[PDB]
Design a protein around this ligand. Structure first.
Ligand SMILES: Nc1nc2c(ncn2[C@@H]2O[C@H](COP(=O)(O)OP(=O)(O)O)[C@@H](O)[C@H]2O)c(=O)[nH]1
Ligand SMILES: Nc1nc2c(ncn2[C@@H]2O[C@H](COP(=O)(O)OP(=O)(O)O)[C@@H](O)[C@H]2O)c(=O)[nH]1
Lengths: 234, 233
């Protein structure tokens, strides 16, 4: 039989992939420079699609109660296409959300909480924006106090060798730096060179967290859309 | 005859000397720590007045601002004085000699800021970009030019009268810390950021102020007179 996972695997490369991630934070603490760095190409609601090969369809919906509305509009178009006489169906259900928190804050701000309370029923990855601004000791205090406030209020993406993947689940929320310019890519200060893909900055754990977990497809599919389905169909 | 300048130089140290500075920006992009770095001591409207020696003692008052409430307070000081100046006996005047407005490195000049500065600048404004280590040097100057072009588009900032090099570097982009590593500065694992090095532009601002506490007269003649010429009418 063992040739049948093969069949699935051979099927997927032939066919696939698709994905749609959503970017909220605050204009501007490095969101469009970082989402560009993520995938090694460059690019009120505005949406942008583009393909990568190595085959991946990305719809990076950058958000430039209106957003509770769009992502939930998409639960509604898919409940529509399912039901549903002739089915082919293109799901632009947002697989993941990337909430950028700014490094100036003892803090996680009230807006950030207010928002995540509203949008935590899609998968949220909290990401600390522009971490070149943070000292190591400073980075640590911020990371812990964010996580602390999260259990104090907020469903988040509960994230599914061992020593290595423990470290990944630990360092969340990832602090990161983005840039298209390179000198090694590239933040040039007359005292030092900020170097993405090191930790230095948390860019590799996030980028690799995103790639290994594109079973966010399922989390979003089963947990969050069904609940809109159970909900409006009542 | 020209000890007479020495007669004035002596009287001034023996009395000297006292100043008040006002802080507005945005909690928190480094305003409370920078100002500590600047005088070398750690410290709705709130004021902290502390006394510093160096033979001259400076009576430094520091009125930090947290968030129409602000112009009210800066102006009350004008009316406290107009009452007091015009009173029968003679006054301890807390007019705001000068304000540092703190602009954030997270802008390609924000609209709260232009709107705020518009209303107020009849108080001397020092525009200072906060936490300057955030900006790479090309972003540092590119941002400086956008503000500097945006500032004139509307805004009276405080006009600064080898004073040659300071004129260009304003608005200042400062980097404040009260930790200390291998001389004040910050510890990143790729490099080390020095307070006071230009590199930082904290030094240019530091001396901009000590060298100019003729901000004292600017307030007294131009800003207060007009409150007075105005409120009298
Ligand atoms: N040091 C540092 N500088 C950054 C970082 N991200 C962006 N910058 C710089 O500041 C700008 C950030 O703007 P942008 O990428 O448009 O962020 P956005 O407004 O959220 O889309 C960039 O053009 C860079 O010049 C970062 O992570 N670290
Ligand atoms: N990158 C950078 N970070 C700073 C600088 N100065 C302070 N910080 C950090 O930001 C915090 C500033 O605190 P504070 O000065 O009280 O901010 P504020 O009072 O809200 O304006 C400190 O805890 C430092 O960790 C700076 O010059 N550059």
């Amino acid at each position: 039989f063992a040739n049948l996972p093969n069949q699935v695997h051979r099927k997927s490369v032939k066919k696939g992939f698709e994905f749609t991630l959503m970017v909220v934070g605050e204009s501007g603490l490095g969101k469009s420079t970082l989402i560009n760095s993520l995938f090694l190409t460059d690019l009120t609601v505005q949406i942008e699609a583009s393909t990568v090969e190595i085959g991946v369809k990305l719809r990076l919906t950058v958000v430039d109660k209106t957003i509770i509305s769009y992502i939930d509009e998409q639960f509604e178009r898919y409940l529509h296409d399912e039901s549903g006489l002739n089915r082919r169906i293109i799901d632009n259900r947002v697989h993941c959300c990337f909430y950028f928190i700014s490094p100036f804050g003892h803090g996680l701000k009230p807006l950030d909480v207010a928002f995540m309370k509203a949008i935590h029923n899609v998968n949220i990855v909290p990401v600390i924006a522009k971490a070149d601004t943070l000292t190591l000791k400073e980075r640590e205090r911020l990371k812990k106090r964010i996580l602390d406030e999260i259990e104090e209020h907020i469903k988040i993406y509960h994230l599914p060798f061992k020593e290595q993947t423990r470290l990944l689940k630990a360092s969340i929320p990832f602090s990161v730096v983005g840039s298209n310019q390179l000198i090694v890519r590239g933040r040039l200060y007359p005292w030092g060179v900020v170097e993405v893909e090191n930790p230095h900055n948390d860019f590799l754990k996030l980028r690799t967290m995103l790639i290994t977990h594109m079973q966010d497809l399922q989390e979003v599919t089963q947990d969050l859309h069904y609940e809109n389905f159970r909900s409006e169909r009542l």
